[PDB]
Structure 1
């Protein structure tokens, strides 16, 4: 997975766009770029690799306790993980209607 920099060089970032000159399988080089905006995100100040849609990659979603979303979610290696998240962290009651904050 990854490791572009081992066989590429003259790399540059301009905003979210990475450009690099990379060795071809059968010889010679090619310059290309990739826009990282759809795959990297800012999570509370940290750059992180964007995850997947949970309805697509998790099964058996259900409420655990009174406030927790639980599911079995796939790793990038297709192993299932038992996982919980507390909806009380960012889900509020505003005047009777559920809202995110």
Structure 2
């Protein structure tokens, strides 16, 4: 539920990054930044908060075969339907370590 702006000042945005100077519980101020690239997305030209983790609206996640993520997920109509996504689309082996591409 946020409300940072109420107890912060000198807020600015540069690219995807918010910086602000915010009141500590016990009197001081601290300047910090948050990168909004992980929490906001462009949907057809409108900035939207990114949905909560898919694990909150999906169940029975499994690996199907060698690279498919399979689950049942809630539609906006609140019904569960079967869905799958090929993790080979974007998950790479970078020298022994799994990395998102």
Bigger Cα displacement from structure 2, 76-85 vs 22-31: 76-85
Unaligned runs of 5+ in 2: none
Residue 51 of structure 2 is matched in structure 1 by 51
Relative to structure 1, the CA distance from residue 92 to residue 55 in structure 2 (aligned partners, 3 Å threshold; closer, same or farther) is same
- TM-superposed CA distance for 1:17, in Å, is 0.3
Name the SS for the 2:33 alignment partner.
Answer: strand
- In the aligned structure 2, how far is the partner of 1:96 from the partner of 1:21? 41
Aligned positions, number: 101
How large is the RMSD of aligned CA atoms in angstroms?
7.5
> Structure 1 unaligned runs (5+)?
none
- Tell me the distance in 1 between the aligned counterparts of 2:93 and 2:27: 61
* 1:57 Cα offset (Å): 3.0
Secondary structure of the equivalent of 2:37? Answer: helix
Which deviates the most, 39-48 or 67-76? Answer: 67-76
